[PDB]
Amino acid sequence: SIRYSELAPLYDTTRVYLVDNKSADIASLNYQNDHSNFQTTVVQNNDFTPAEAGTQTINFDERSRWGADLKTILRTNMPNINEFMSTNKFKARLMVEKKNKETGLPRYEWFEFTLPEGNYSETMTIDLMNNAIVDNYLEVGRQNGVLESDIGVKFDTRNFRLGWDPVTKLVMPGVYTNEAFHPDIVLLPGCGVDFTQSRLSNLLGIRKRLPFQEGFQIMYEDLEGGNIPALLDVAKYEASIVIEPVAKDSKNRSYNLLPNDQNNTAYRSWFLAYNYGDPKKGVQSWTLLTTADVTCGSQQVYWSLPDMMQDPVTFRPSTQVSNYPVVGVELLPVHAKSFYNEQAVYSQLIRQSTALTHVFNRFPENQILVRPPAPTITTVSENVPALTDHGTLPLRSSISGVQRVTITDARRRTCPYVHKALGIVAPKVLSSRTF
């Protein structure tokens, strides 16, 4: 028996529907409640004008222990770069000033950076970092006497070994290659970055081999042997047929050469040290290389119902929103879609030709500080609605008429990016509470 006050006692797997869009009839119960954590009325009884029908309970039988057949859908429009999952709260130390210190070495300071919150591809977000890392050199650093070719941190998607002849240890056509292999960092040693406060390391793929061990900061002394080499002076090699490393570029911008005679540069790189150094003691032993993976990893959402369900084991039935009993752990519906192309390195020049702007491309002549090329494997994060199942789990006997639905993330708070929540509960008989 599945008893209700107004109707006749029906039987044996009715269906109760926990919708969200009905809540506009109860226009007084959930103001500060978001769209994920909301309240709705189960009854959906048009006879009673359900502002008043929020009290008529659905009394299940108390002689046999019931059990639900939970189903739900969930489609969450959630941007790939937000302020909620901490995609724009990291630290990246920079070389601030070297002029008025009178101590020799320059001064460093850890700077917290932000990103303009939207939804961006991996070919753009790495190049949107250059709107963050420049705007605390273009703001703070340039005013205090340090040259433009001395910017500490720049993320990059390219390689620096494709012409590296060990006869010479330079690049024989004199230009670094323009393909994009993996997003690594390009660095000046002394002013490292951080990802422990952030989740942005999931975006790049520069994460940690032993991931749990607290504290993950790729400081700029841990990269040993991964010096980016210099350029063979092809403007002077081809005009002499002798070997010269290119010290300065075409606008009085120099590199950082250890002496001028060594064919390495002080500019280092992570991918240049992950696969071109010692495979046992280097950065390869405590970091690893992963996929492009713009989605940053879907943190699971905890589908929870406080009063529909008698709880799973070891859950307090408390009223605190970060302590609701979880009745199902479904996947975050943010889904990765890898759109491939080949012209994307040239489409960079196509997207520049329709604007005539060096706004998004600062430093086009410094070959290290060139705008990082578009990868051929671009990835975007669309949002597929997930009709999922959570099996079977027990039921509170006298379900209240008004009812709360709560979707809870991995950080154990309510999601603000859930914007279509819909739960379907179907009772059935499990066992016999009486003998």
């Binding site: 006050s5 009290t55 008529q56 309970t57 009394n59």
Partner: protein, 44 residues
Amino acid sequence: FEVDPMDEPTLLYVLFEVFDVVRIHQPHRGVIEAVYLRTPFSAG
């Protein structure tokens, strides 16, 4: 009803005196169980 004219938007407050009874007991140490009744607007 039909009422006077006013100035403010008003609400017509009805207080149905309709039997609210709770029947609680505990068969154990920390197992308290409530049974309600209100008999229109039924709940149990």
